[PDB]
RNA sequence: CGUCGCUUUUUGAUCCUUCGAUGUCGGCUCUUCCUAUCAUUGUGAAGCAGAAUUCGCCAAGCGUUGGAUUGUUCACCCACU
RNA sequence: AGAACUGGCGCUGCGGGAUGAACCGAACGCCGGGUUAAGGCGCCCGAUGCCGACGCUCAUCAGACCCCAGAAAAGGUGUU
């Protein structure tokens, strides 16, 4: 149906490069919680790339031409839109089937989160190598809405914290629950043959 | 005057090497310039005194 | 925090390559990245394997500093590495994973059948250990 | 010369076409690293004319032979001697491996002498390659590995990506 | 070069005890107590032995710029220890020609309101980092006294002294007025 | 060292195109009947022979 | 004394485009861009006491005039700055 | 600007060089299956989604593939 991509701990370019081609054959993929991805290199390295990017300005009126898009949702969604083909209507239907969306919203904050191996900070720098958060390299340039998302932030995994404290509540039950066997019978194929 | 304090003020003002590229301020027993902008050469002179 | 390190006499699991599932001795480090490993009494000889082939388990084996291929086989059998390798819960797992691998049809039928079997017993206990719980925090 | 793969020790002997001056020339010998026979017995004639006035119409070869080695189970300390071509003058240089085998440890010149130096294998001439034993070795990372009881663990290991899937909701733990 | 590991050790004395919540390091001991996160900087740390308190801080594998900073690590565990124990004194004296600096405290050991700098009428309000204390001298003339646990923040503290005395679009080998650092010592002596 | 005959025969393939070809070289060809790409021929080796194949 | 570059705001060398035609000097008017920075901001160095100057650095945000002669670009002079 | 030798373009499509007269492969009746050359194989864009090998390198103007489309002398206790 749909699959849902947690952001955090991603690279820019190794995470929109795979979702890029997700889309294409077909599915629908949602990237959430886009203000912690990762760029490679130190934060001034990426901050003035980013600026040289913002005097791309057309000079008879900025009004056409470049869309210089400061949330890092748009900043993300820009990434996969230049690995599309999307002045062909196969890629302007592949860019309907992508929804980045910044923080998480209450659609999203309840199904069960993916993450790309492929495209980890973790897995693919080196540790001892510099890299830029998107999350204060757009509040450097004019995103205004980092305090209030962070807020929100907050308050979405404190409620975070008391469903999964219920949840390891109930399984430490049915754990106990099953210490009462009575049904070994049962569990005789499974140990045969992987429980 | 206080000529205790007069060595004391020199220590951080005067008795330091000068570049002849990148003309920072360095320290008295610097080889290089730390500043990129010459490439950290190796061409110092003491700082002038009066 | 680094619990287990490489060492001579220390026993490694082989994850992939031509040689994959089947215990070495780490006989000597070479150079960097590159270890010299045998297992005389599981069917792989005497080579150098890379370091990133290699999982390091928690057996060690009191064996020279580059010994022959009997010296090594007589402190793989006195400490006995292939029945220790038995119980141990890692190779419990990867015991119960290529049975789950070859689990034929007929016997997926099998396990579907008494699967649900035990989840109705463990349901309506666990609905049971619910109806006390209440039942202690209503007074 | 590629050195495609890895290389391969030959023990090549070759003399001069016996004229009605000379019978019987000295059937000169050398050793050389080649990826095949056909490389081996031409990098045969490039040594040797350019040490002593024989080419391959005016010369033959008649052994061209793999030699191997004595213990390819025992670690080694190789230091070689080489004659490499930089963009500017040519160079000598000694260098020291720790390998299995005599073919291995210049294969694993070749690799750093393009990973250092940036030297093409055209450009590089081997000039003897021995087994050489400890406490006589210069350079220290040959050296750092000459320890009974040496230990060492391995730190942030990375590998198998996509394999393991492309999308897991795991995040891999890097030990 | 990828060299096999370096180690440098700290011994501690019984006074102070480092506990360590994983690269981060709690230093508790007399006057106070102080942390720091090394949380950046990839090395494994390992307190040995009770009755003797020996600290193993080791780098496995690293390069020469990685190596490098495994003696950065014992260097800062060293001064939380000595700042812990005796802390940290900086006395620094004004020096002045003609005009007289005048330095007050504001605000209970934290601000310091430095004003006829040279004859300037613009005060100088330099607030502090939060755990140094100010002091004007006794027995000394024009002798300021900065006492604290934490050495890069009573030596933050003194740079802001002497940073905001500056001397502007003048000849700075004459003009030599400021307020400079004199010594470096401990709040408890001699241990 | 007993040294083994060198070789009679020779099988040679044409690998590479026919366009961008000196005539010296084609005229070879010519004679040993390449004249497609991948087409083979045995050739008797001789000093006349392997003159001929040093050419091409 | 050497010697190594850059730039295409000068002049040439060239003759690729344009001869069934690309309106050809200068001034006026107005816009935007470059930095190889005159001034202003923050700095560093002097054979920098102050004042006045000079040499560098991040720097093109913002300014860089009024006239006499000359068709002049250019030049030169007066005056303010 | 003007010669020599050979191949090309002009008279010539096609594959690669993003783009293109002349570069690199290769020359062409209309198709089906197979294989390749030059060139490639993150995603546009077919193909490394190989548990590839070994090193070198951090740039506040990185680098990145014949012709071909940007740099020298000099210098660096930057690392090898
Ligand atoms: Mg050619």
Known sequence: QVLVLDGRGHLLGRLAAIVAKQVLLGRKVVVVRCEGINISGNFYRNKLKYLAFLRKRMNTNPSRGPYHFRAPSRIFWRTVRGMLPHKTKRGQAALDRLKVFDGIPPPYDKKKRMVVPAALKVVRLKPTRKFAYLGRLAHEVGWKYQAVTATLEEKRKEKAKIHYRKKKQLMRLRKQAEKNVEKKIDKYTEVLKTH | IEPSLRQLAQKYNCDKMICRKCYARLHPRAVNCRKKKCGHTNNLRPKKKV | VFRRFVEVGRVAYVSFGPHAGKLVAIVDVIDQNRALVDGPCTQVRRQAMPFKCMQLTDFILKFPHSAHQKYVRQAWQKADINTKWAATRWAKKIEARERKAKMTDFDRFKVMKAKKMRNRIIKNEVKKLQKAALLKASP | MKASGTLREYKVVGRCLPTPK?????????????????????????????????????????????????????????????????????????????????????????????????????????????????????????????????????????????????????????? | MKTILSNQTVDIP?????????????????????????????????????????????????????????????????????????????????????????????????????????????????????????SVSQAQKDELILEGNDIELVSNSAALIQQATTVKNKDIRKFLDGIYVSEKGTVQQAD | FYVPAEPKLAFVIRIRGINGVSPKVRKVLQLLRLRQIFNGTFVKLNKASINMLRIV
């Open chain 4, 22 to 175: 000379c019978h019987t020339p000295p059937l000169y010998r050398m050793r050389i690293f080649a990826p095949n026979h056909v490389v081996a017995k031409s990098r045969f004639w490039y040594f040797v004319s350019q040490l002593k006035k024989m080419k391959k119409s005016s010369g033959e070869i008649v052994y061209c032979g793999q030699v191997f080695e004595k213990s390819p189970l025992r670690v080694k300390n190789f230091g070689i001697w080489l004659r490499y071509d930089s963009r500017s003058g040519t160079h000598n240089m000694y260098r020291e491996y720790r390998d299995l085998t005599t073919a291995g440890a210049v294969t694993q010149c070749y690799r750093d002498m393009g990973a250092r130096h940036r030297a093409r294998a055209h450009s590089i001439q081997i000039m003897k390659v021995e087994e050489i034993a400890a406490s006589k070795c210069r350079r220290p990372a040959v050296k750092q590995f000459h320890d009974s009881k040496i230990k060492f663990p391995l730190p942030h290991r990375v590998l198998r990506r996509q394999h393991k899937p492309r999308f897991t909701t795991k995040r891999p733990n890097t030990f």
């Open chain 5, 14 to 134: 019984e006074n102070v005890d480092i506990t360590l919540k994983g690269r981060t390091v709690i230093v508790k001991g007399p006057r106070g107590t102080l942390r720091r996160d090394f949380n950046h900087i990839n090395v494994e740390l390992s307190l040995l032995g009770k009755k003797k308190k020996r600290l193993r801080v080791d780098k496995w594998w690293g390069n020469r710029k990685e190596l490098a900073t495994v003696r950065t690590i014992c260097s800062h565990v060293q001064n939380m220890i000595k700042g812990v124990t005796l802390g940290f004194r900086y006395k620094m004296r004004s020096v002045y020609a003609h005009f007289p600096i005048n330095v007050v405290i504001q605000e209970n050991g934290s601000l310091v309101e430095i004003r006829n700098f040279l004859g300037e009428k613009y005060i100088r309000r330099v607030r502090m980092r939060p755990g140094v204390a100010c």
